[PDB]
Point group: C4
Chain length 173, copies 4
Amino acid sequence: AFKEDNTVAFKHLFLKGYSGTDEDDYSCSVYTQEDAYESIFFAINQYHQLKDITLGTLGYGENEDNRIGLKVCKQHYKKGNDVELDCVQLDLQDLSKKPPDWKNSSFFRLEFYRLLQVEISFHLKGIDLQTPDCYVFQNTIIFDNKAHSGKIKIYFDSDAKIEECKDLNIFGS
Amino acid sequence: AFKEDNTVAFKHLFLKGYSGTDEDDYSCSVYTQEDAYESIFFAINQYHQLKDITLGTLGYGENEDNRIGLKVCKQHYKKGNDVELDCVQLDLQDLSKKPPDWKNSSFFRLEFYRLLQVEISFHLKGIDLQTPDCYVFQNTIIFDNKAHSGKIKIYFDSDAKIEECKDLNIFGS
Amino acid sequence: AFKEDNTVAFKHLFLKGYSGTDEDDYSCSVYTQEDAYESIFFAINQYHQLKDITLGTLGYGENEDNRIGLKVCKQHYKKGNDVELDCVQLDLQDLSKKPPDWKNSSFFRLEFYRLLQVEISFHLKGIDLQTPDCYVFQNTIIFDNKAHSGKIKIYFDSDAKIEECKDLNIFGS
Amino acid sequence: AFKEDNTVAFKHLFLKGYSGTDEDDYSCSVYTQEDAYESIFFAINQYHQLKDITLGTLGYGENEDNRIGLKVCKQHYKKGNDVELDCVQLDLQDLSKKPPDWKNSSFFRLEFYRLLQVEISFHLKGIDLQTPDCYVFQNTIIFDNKAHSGKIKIYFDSDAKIEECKDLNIFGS
Ligand SMILES: [Cl-]
Ligand SMILES: [Cl-]
Ligand SMILES: [Cl-]
Ligand SMILES: [Cl-]
Ligand SMILES: [Cl-]
Ligand SMILES: [Cl-]
Ligand SMILES: [Cl-]
Ligand SMILES: [Cl-]
Ligand SMILES: [K+]
Ligand SMILES: [K+]
Ligand SMILES: [K+]
Ligand SMILES: [K+]
């Protein structure tokens, strides 16, 4: 229950306007450019402020490539059927910067008519105090526009694995 | 899936307060004069600002009669059982005018006690990038007051046909 | 369908926050003194402004006793098991008065701990243009506190009968 | 029906944003620190202002230990698997104080990463006028964080027993 129950809470934390029930194979969806932007930026802002939000026993974790914070990738048709992959890494200092210069980068000027998808990925670490067992949560938020139907499908994927209790930082401690 | 999935997105784009599920044979309904006005004007305003809203690969299309923009028709009992049909054509320049003089025309001074229906019709063009196939969407928004029961039923009808890829303008490109 | 469909519209017009589906044997309910007041005053205000709200082919009708406007009755335990019935008649001039002095009467200083129920009753007249047949709607809004359980159950009752087409006044004509 | 129907009304009165239907074995839930605080403080504030809210025939009652008002208890892991229980008693004078100094106590500086649960308990007295029978309601609001899953489950428990009609004070009388 610990890993599965944390996944539900992550959907409520990171998916803007999540109703509490998945729409279909995806958690929720958007139909406008404004709502797509607001959902992407909400997920990033909730990650940035996670210590003042979460009710769990969690902390930030390093990614698979040792980069810290969020990896934001996007796929879009090249200007001229070829698909181009672009990624940006937003660490904790990037997200805490004032002005938050990362929001004005060219990466976030999305061209929805040729955008296939946006993916946000990050790791969280959690401790199961009720049993202690430490988990690494590999989280991915996918903004799927591959159908190009006017609807973006939003998925929250979380793979959790038991790991050694090494990372000390738990939010609120 | 492309034409059918675009129809769902059109309901979210053009029907004010659409819950995401059709009420019955119609998509949604209104019970007040204020809500009837707000739903009609919302559909027109969403069409006017479509390039900054849609997540799809769409553009405006010409109507069957070569008129551009929206055709708004209304049916009402004549002043004196005979039904009178009145139509107005709102092109892109009409909708972009400041002040938007079209909103103050006598056509939009509705008399609900004798109004049978209001119909908004327009064409959109779309490209199925996932497969390319070009579609013409013949859209009709019907505000049905024929029951005169205090409830206006709102339908969104879309007939989509495959056509030659001739029109160049796709929103955001 | 005409009389039954008008009843649905009346629930949307006169019952504050009506969800569109009846809760149980009653249409909706309230759990606070503020919400009870707001629902009662909303029903009265919607009646007062009915000509600028309804989408139907309706007009005001005289009551069974020839009094015009709304009859508001309340039942409460006497100060000292005996039930006392008090009524007020709010005609169209009472509801249009500025200040609306009727709202400050002692009748509307409700004592919820001993209040059994509040009843609002009025007649509306309607014409079935689709077929013409004229209907008299005998409407009653009941705020039922007889259980004294902390929940007021709100019912909308409408009995409609075919009558001669004599009354001329239809809202918006 | 009297005791059971009052329980439904208590859920609407004391549980912030209660939808009217229990989520599962609990009435509702929260996923953020802000929402946890807002739900706890709402329950206390609704108790404090109960005379201007309830539609029932109720009054405040003494607790099992003769203390008046609310007992708020919390369970949390000690700083250094041992569980510590801390309680505060908020009487009617504490809740009516300006500034309400009770809100700034160290007790209400919650540490969610080690918080097991928060419990609010109080008694209400009610009279069944429809039949008179007097009831004592032993109410408990539990904010359950024992899973440490990121979700706090909120329960409303009410045990009601018939007692002698001795307490005079009924709200609004
Ligand atoms: Cl935008
Ligand atoms: Cl892009
Ligand atoms: Cl209006
Ligand atoms: Cl008209
Ligand atoms: Cl009040
Ligand atoms: Cl009263
Ligand atoms: Cl907070
Ligand atoms: Cl604590
Ligand atoms: K998984
Ligand atoms: K069709
Ligand atoms: K009836
Ligand atoms: K019980």
